[PDB]
Amino acid sequence: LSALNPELVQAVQHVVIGPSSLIVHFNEVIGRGHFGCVYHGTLLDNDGKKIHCAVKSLNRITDIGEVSQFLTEGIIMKDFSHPNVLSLLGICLRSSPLVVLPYMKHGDLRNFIRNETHNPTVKDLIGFGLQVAKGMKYLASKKFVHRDLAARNCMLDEKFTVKVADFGLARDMYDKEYYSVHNKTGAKLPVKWMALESLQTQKFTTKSDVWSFGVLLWELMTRGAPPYPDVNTFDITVYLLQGRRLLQPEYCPDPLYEVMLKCWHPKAEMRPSFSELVSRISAIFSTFI
Numbered sequence: 001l002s003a004l005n006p007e008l009v010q011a012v013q014h015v016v017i018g019p020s021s022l023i024v025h026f027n028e029v030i031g032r033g034h035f036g037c038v039y040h041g042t043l044l045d046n047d048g049k050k051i052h053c054a055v056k057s058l059n060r061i062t063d064i065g066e067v068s069q070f071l072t073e074g075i076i077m078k079d080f081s082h083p084n085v086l087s088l089l090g091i092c093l094r095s096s097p098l099v100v101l102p103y104m105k106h107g108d109l110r111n112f113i114r115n116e117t118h119n120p121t122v123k124d125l126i127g128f129g130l131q132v133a134k135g136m137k138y139l140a141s142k143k144f145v146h147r148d149l150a151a152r153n154c155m156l157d158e159k160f161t162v163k164v165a166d167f168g169l170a171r172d173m174y175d176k177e178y179y180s181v182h183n184k185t186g187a188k189l190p191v192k193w194m195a196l197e198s199l200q201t202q203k204f205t206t207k208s209d210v211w212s213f214g215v216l217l218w219e220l221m222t223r224g225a226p227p228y229p230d231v232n233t234f235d236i237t238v239y240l241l242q243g244r245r246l247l248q249p250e251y252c253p254d255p256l257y258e259v260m261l262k263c264w265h266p267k268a269e270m271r272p273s274f275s276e277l278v279s280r281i282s283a284i285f286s287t288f289i
Ligand SMILES: CN1CCC(COc2cnc(-c3cccc(Cn4nc(-c5cccc(C#N)c5)ccc4=O)c3)nc2)CC1
Pocket: 030, 031, 032, 038, 054, 086, 101, 102, 103, 104, 105, 106, 107, 108, 152, 153, 154, 155, 165, 166, 167, 170, 171, 174, 175
């Protein structure tokens, strides 16, 4: 890493965590991304109080340009903050590079809602959706496009707070079943969560994140059923163009299905904003015991 531009190193210094502040348990994988496994560790604060971390080791870096990009992105991502978006705690360089993230005790949202020993109420599930909407309202306000919003890509902490995750230095494929390669460009695409226009052009916007959010709501209301199980990946674009959409789940309230449907409008500009979604979903949430 002595090949890095020294001004970049100085610019990222405030994101860097020294090895003597970290204790990582590399003997046990706690999560798996295509581009790296995740391990538990602890970060020592200024008192020596332990902060629990998920530490991710990036696995296919080959050139200093990639590292430089990673550091540049880290500076941007470090200064994001919202209670429903995952924080970047820092990067450890003097230990491959380690991305240091807050530990998420209850794992990804899709696994949480599929846990048969727990019974989230309908209200709880809608509340998870509301929390995601609030995190996305924040990302949208930063002009940041997620591109891979899905229940598998959101996390829950010890207070059951939902964090939009899988972005910035945490971006990866954490369940490879749902990504398909596009020939023309080599992009790995989460096809069954994508907006029609993104399927046609491979371009993404905040309004395509709104489409994905509608799919995530459907995931919540089905307790983690896979969307369009009988539609092959390569047939989803046509399925949508034919005027077909995911069906209303049995226990999805009518006003929430209406929200879903608006998120899947064929014209991006006609989909609700995340600000509108927070408002409307907060009303729906409030009507349940
Ligand atoms: C029973 N089980 C025992 C282990 C418990 C704690 O394990 C943890 C695992 N991972 C983290 C962690 C924290 C912050 C950031 C990330 C990275 N990241 N990962 C995912 C992710 C992780 C695992 C599976 C799937 C899928 N599909 C997706 C999504 C988005 C994202 O950004 C990981 N924290 C704790 C959970 C309950």
